Amino acid sequence: KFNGLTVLPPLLTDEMIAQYTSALLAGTITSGWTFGAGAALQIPFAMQM
């Protein structure tokens, strides 16, 4: 930004993109394939495999 090329910051910061990832991981560990196609349905991961 000192030489005249302005870098605009992204709308999603690093903590929230990482929160999107942790949300998608927590959903795969718990809800599995359900929350992508609908409401999150709790299933144990031992039965998920």
Partner: protein, 49 residues
């Protein structure tokens, strides 16, 4: 700065520093701040804020 060095440049080959030709002082050159004007307004039929 070394004794024979008048000014100096950064990685962009733009001058980031200059030494006083009269007295002895070393100052960094930072261009003046600028940027774009972003307008936050709702629709014309909502309000004028």
């Amino acid at each position: 700065f070394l004794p024979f060095q008048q000014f100096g440049r950064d990685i962009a080959d733009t001058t980031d520093a200059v030494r006083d030709p009269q007295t002895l002082e070393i100052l960094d050159i930072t261009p003046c701040s600028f940027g774009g004007v972003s307008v936050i307004t709702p629709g014309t039929n909502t309000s004028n804020q």
